[PDB]
Amino acid sequence: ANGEVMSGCHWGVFKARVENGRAVAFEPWDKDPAPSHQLPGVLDSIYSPTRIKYPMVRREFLEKGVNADRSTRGNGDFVRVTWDEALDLVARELKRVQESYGPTGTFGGSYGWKSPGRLHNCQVLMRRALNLAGGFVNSSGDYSTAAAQIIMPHVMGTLEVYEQQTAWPVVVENTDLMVFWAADPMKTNEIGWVIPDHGAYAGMKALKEKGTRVICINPVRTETADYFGADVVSPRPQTDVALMLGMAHTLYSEDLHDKDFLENCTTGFDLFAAYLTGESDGTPKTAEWAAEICGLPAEQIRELARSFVAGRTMLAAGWSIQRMHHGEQAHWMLVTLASMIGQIGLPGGGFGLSYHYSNGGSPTSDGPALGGISDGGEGGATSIPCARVVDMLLNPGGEFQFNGATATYPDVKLAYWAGGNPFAHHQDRNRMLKAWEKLETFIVQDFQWTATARHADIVLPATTSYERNDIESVGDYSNRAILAMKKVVDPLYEARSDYDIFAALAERLGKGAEFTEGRDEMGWISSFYEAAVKQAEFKNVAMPSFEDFWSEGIVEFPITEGANFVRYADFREDPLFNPLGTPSGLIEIYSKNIEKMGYDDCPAHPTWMEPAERLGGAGAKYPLHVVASHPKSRLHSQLNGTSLRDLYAVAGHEPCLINPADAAARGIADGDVLRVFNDRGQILVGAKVSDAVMPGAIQIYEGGWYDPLDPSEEGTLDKYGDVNVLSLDVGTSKLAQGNCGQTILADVEKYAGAPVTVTVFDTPKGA
Ligand SMILES: Nc1nc2c(c(=O)[nH]1)N[C@H]1C(S)=C(S)[C@@H](COP(=O)(O)OP(=O)(O)OC[C@H]3O[C@@H](n4cnc5c(=O)[nH]c(N)nc54)[C@H](O)[C@@H]3O)O[C@H]1N2
Numbered sequence: 085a086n087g088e089v090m091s092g093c094h095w096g097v098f099k100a101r102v103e104n105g106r107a108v109a110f111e112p113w114d115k116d117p118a119p120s121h122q123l124p125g126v127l128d129s130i131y132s133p134t135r136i137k138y139p140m141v142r143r144e145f146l147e148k149g150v151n152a153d154r155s156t157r158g159n160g161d162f163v164r165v166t167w168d169e170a171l172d173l174v175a176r177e178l179k180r181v182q183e184s185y186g187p188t189g190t191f192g193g194s195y196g197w198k199s200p201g202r203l204h205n206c207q208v209l210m211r212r213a214l215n216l217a218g219g220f221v222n223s224s225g226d227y228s229t230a231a232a233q234i235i236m237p238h239v240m241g242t243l244e245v246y247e248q249q250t251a252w253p254v255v256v257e258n259t260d261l262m263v264f265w266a267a268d269p270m271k272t273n274e275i276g277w278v279i280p281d282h283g284a285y286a287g288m289k290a291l292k293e294k295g296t297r298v299i300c301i302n303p304v305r306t307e308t309a310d311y312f313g314a315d316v317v318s319p320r321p322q323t324d325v326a327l328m329l330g331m332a333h334t335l336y337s338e339d340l341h342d343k344d345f346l347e348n349c350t351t352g353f354d355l356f357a358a359y360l361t362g363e364s365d366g367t368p369k370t371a372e373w374a375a376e377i378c379g380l381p382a383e384q385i386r387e388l389a390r391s392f393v394a395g396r397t398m399l400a401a402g403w404s405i406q407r408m409h410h411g412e413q414a415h416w417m418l419v420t421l422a423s424m425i426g427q428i429g430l431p432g433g434g435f436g437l438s439y440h441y442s443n444g445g446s447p448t449s450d451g452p453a454l455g456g457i458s459d460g461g462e463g464g465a466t467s468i469p470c471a472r473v474v475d476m477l478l479n480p481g482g483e484f485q486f487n488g489a490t491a492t493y494p495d496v497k498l499a500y501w502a503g504g505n506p507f508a509h510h511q512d513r514n515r516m517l518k519a520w521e522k523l524e525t526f527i528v529q530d531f532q533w534t535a536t537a538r539h540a541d542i543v544l545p546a547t548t549s550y551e552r553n554d555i556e557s558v559g560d561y562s563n564r565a566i567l568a569m570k571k572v573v574d575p576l577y578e579a580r581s582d583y584d585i586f587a588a589l590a591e592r593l594g595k596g597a598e599f600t601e602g603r604d605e606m607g608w609i610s611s612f613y614e615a616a617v618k619q620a621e622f623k624n625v626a627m628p629s630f631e632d633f634w635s636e637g638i639v640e641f642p643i644t645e646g647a648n649f650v651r652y653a654d655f656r657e658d659p660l661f662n663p664l665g666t667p668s669g670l671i672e673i674y675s676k677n678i679e680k681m682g683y684d685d686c687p688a689h690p691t692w693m694e695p696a697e698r699l700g701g702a703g704a705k706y707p708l709h710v711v712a713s714h715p716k717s718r719l720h721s722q723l724n725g726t727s728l729r730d731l732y733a734v735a736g737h738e739p740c741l742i743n744p745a746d747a748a749a750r751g752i753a754d755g756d757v758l759r760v761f762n763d764r765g766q767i768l769v770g771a772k773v774s775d776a777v778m779p780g781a782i783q784i785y786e787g788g789w790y791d792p793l794d795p796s797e798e799g800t801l802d803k804y805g806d807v808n809v810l811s812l813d814v815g816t817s818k819l820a821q822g823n824c825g826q827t828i829l830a831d832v833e834k835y836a837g838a839p840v841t842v843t844v845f846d847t848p849k850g851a
Pocket residue numbers: 228265266267268271272273274275301302303304306319320321322323324402403404405440441711712713714715716717718719720826
C-alpha cells in the first residue's frame with residue numbers, strides 16, 4: 085500500500101509513511117511534547133541485517149537433542165528448517181519435560197521489555213500455552229527495583245516505586261530546591277512500559293522557566309545537569325548511604341531535625357539516633373566519618389544538609405543505587421533522611437521514586453482502565469526472584485532465603501524465552517555460559533539476532549508490532565488516551581506473530597479452543613475496548629463506538645483533579661485516620677519484623693556496610709568503578725543492530741566515557757581501541773575522553789551485544805562491548821535477592837593485541 089499509518093511503541097506515538105508496501109519514515113506525533121530521537125532506529129529494526137528470516141535449529145541439537153555437547157551453544161552452526169519441523173520439535177520437547185519431570189521441569193519467567201500492546205503480549209501468550217501443557221516455574225520482581233520494591237512495603241507500607249508522584253504543576257508552584265539523587269530524568273523519561281506520553285518534559289520545561297535551584301548527586305554531569313545549569317555533587321559510587329548518614333548527623337547535632345514529624349509519623353527514631361551518635365556501636369557517624377568514605381569535603385556535606393531544611397525540598401531519587409550490593413539500604417536511608425527533614429505530605433516536599441521513570445508526575449486523567457489477554461493461571465519452589473536464575477541452575481534442590489522465607493530451588497530442564505535478552509541483561513557472562521549447560525533445551529523467540537538468539541538450540545522468528553493490529557494506553561501514569569496500534573506493513577520473510585506461534589503449539593497439544601476462545605484478532609481487540617467503554621459509562625466519561633474509535637485511531641481523556649495530587653497529604657493531615665500498611669501504621673525507621681529474620685546483610689534499621697568491591701574500599705583489587713547505566717540511544721539492547729548505532733559507536737565498539745586524568749595516566753587518547761578487564765572477564769570498547777565523568781569512574785552503558793572472539797575458549801575476549809561480561813552475580817541481601825549490576829570495579833588499557841572484526845551485527849550464515 086501507499087499512505088500514512090498511526091501506531092505506537094515504547095518510544096512514543098508515531099505516524100508512519102508507507103510507499104509500495106515498505107515503511108520509509110516513522111515521524112513524530114504532532115501532540116508529543118518531546119519526541120524520541122530513536123524513531124529512525126525503531127523503523128530500521130524491521131529491515132536490518134539482523135532481522136530473523138526463518139526458523140532455525142542448531143546442528144548439534146537437530147542431530148542429538150538432549151544428548152548434544154552443550155558447550156557448543158553460540159558457535160554459529162545453525163540449520164534452516166520449515167515451520168512444521170520447528171513447531172513439532174518444540175511441542176515434542178514441551179510434552180517430554182512435562183511427562184518426565186512435572187511443572188518444575190520448565191522455566192517460564194522469560195524476563196524482558198518486549199513491546200507494548202494488550203493482545204500481542206508475548207510473555208502472557210507464552211504462559212497461556214505453558215499452563216495448557218501442565219505448568220511452569222515463574223519469576224518474581226524485576227531487574228529495575230528488586231531491592232526497593234521489597235524494603236518499601238516494610239517501611240512505607242506500599243511498593244512506592246511504581247505509584248503516582250506529586251503532580252508536576254504542584255512541584256513547579258511550591259518547590260524551592262529540587263534534588264535529583266542518582267537520576268537522569270532528561271535521559272530516562274524517553275521510554276514508557278505502555279506508550280509514553282513524555283509528560284515529564286512539560287514539567288521540566290516549566291521548572292527551568294521558573295528558575296528553581298536544582299542539584300544532582302551523581303558521578304556523571306548529565307544532560308539533566310546541562311539543561312538546568314545544576315550544581316553537580318559527585319560522591320564515590322556506592323557511598324551514598326554514608327553521605328546520607330553524615331547529613332543526618334549534622335541535622336541532629338545542630339537541632340535542625342523535625343521532632344514533631346518524627347513523633348507523629350514514624351516509629352524507631354530513638355534506636356536509629358543511638359546508631360547515628362555512636363552510642364550503640366562506638367562509631368559516631370559524623371560529617372568527617374562520612375567524608376573519609378565518600379570523598380567529599382566535610383563542610384560540603386554539612387552545607388548540603390543545612391540547605392535541605394532552609395526551604396521546600398523534593399528528594400527525587402533514581403534506581404541505580406539499589407541495583408548494587410546491600411541495595412535495600414539506599415531508599416530506606418533516603419526515607420529516613422526525608423523524615424528528619426519533615427516535609428513528607430506537603431505540596432512540593434518530601435521524596436519521589438518515579439520522577440525519572442515513565443513520566444511519573446504527569447497528571448492522571450479521568451479515563452477508564454484498559455485490560456488485555458490473560459495467562460490462564462506484561463503490564464522445589466514454584467517461583468524464584470528473577471536474578472537468581474544462574475544460582476538455581478547451579479544448585480538444584482539447594483536452599484535459599486528470601487524476605488523471611490526458606491525454600492529450595494526447583495530442578496529446571498527446559499527454558500523458553502520470548503521478548504527478552506538474558507545474554508545482555510544478566511550478570512557475569514562467563515559464569516552464565518557454563519551454568520547454561522545444565523539446561524537440556526533452550527528455545528528463543530525474537531525478531532532480532534541478539535546474543536540470546538545466537539545461544540539457542542531452537543530459534544523462532546516473531547513479527548514486530550508494526551506487522552499486526554493492537555490496542556494500548558498512552559501515558560503510564562497519566563492515562564491520557566487509548567490508541568489503535570494499526571498494522572503498518574505485512575509480516576516480513578517467514579515471521580509469525582507470537583500469538584500465531586503459541587496458538588499452533590496449543591493446537592498440537594489438543595488445547596486449541598482453550599487458547600483462542602474461538603476469537604480472532606479484531607474480536608479480542610474489540611472485547612478489550614468494550615470493557616473500557618462499560619467502565620467509563622459508570623463514571624460518566626464519553627466514548628465512541630468501536631467502529632468510530634478504530635477509524636479515528638485514538639480516544640483522549642481529560643484531566644481535572646489529577647492536576648492537584650499531593651503524595652502523602654492524607655497521612656500527614658491525620659496519621660491515625662489514614663494509617664500506613666505497616667505493623668505500627670507509621671513509617672518504620674526501625675523494623676521489628678526485619679529484626680526477627682536475623683539477616684546479617686540486612687539489619688533492622690538503615691546501616692552502612694562495606695560492599696563486596698568499591699572505589700576507596702579496603703582491599704579493592706581493581707582501580708576504577710564501572711558506571712553500567714542505561715543507554716541514551718537504545719532501550720537496553722534494543723536497536724544495537726540498526727543504523728542508529730552510528731550515532732555513538734567508537735571504532736566500531738561500544739563507547740567508554742573516561743576522565744582526562746585517568747586516560748593520560750595510561751597513555752590513552754580519544755578514539756583509541758581499549759581493553760577493559762577484571763578477574764571475571766575482558767571486553768573491547770572505544771575511548772570517549774571527557775571530564776563529564778569523575779576521576780576514578782568510567783561509564784560503559786548496559787545493552788551491548790556480546791561478540792566472542794573464540795566461542796570455544798573459556799574467558800574469551802568480547803569484540804564489541806557487553807558490560808555484563810565484567811559484573812558480579814550475587815544477591816543484594818537475603819531480604820530482596822536483587823541483582824547487583826552496578827557493583828563493578830575494573831582496569832582499562834590501550835588494546836595491544838591483533839586486529840579483530842565485529843560480526844554480531846551481520847546476518848548469520850544460512851539465515
Ligand atoms: N533511553 C533510555 N531510557 C530508559 C531506559 C533505557 O534503556 N534507555 N531504561 C528504562 C528502565 S527499565 C529504567 S529502570 C530507567 C533507569 O532508571 P535508573 O536505574 O535510575 O537509571 P541509570 O541510568 O541506571 O542510573 C541513573 C543515574 O544514576 C547515576 N549513578 C550510578 N551509580 C551511582 C552511585 O553510586 N551514586 C549516585 N549518586 N549516582 C549513581 C548514573 O550516573 C545515572 O545518571 O530508565 C528507563 N528509560
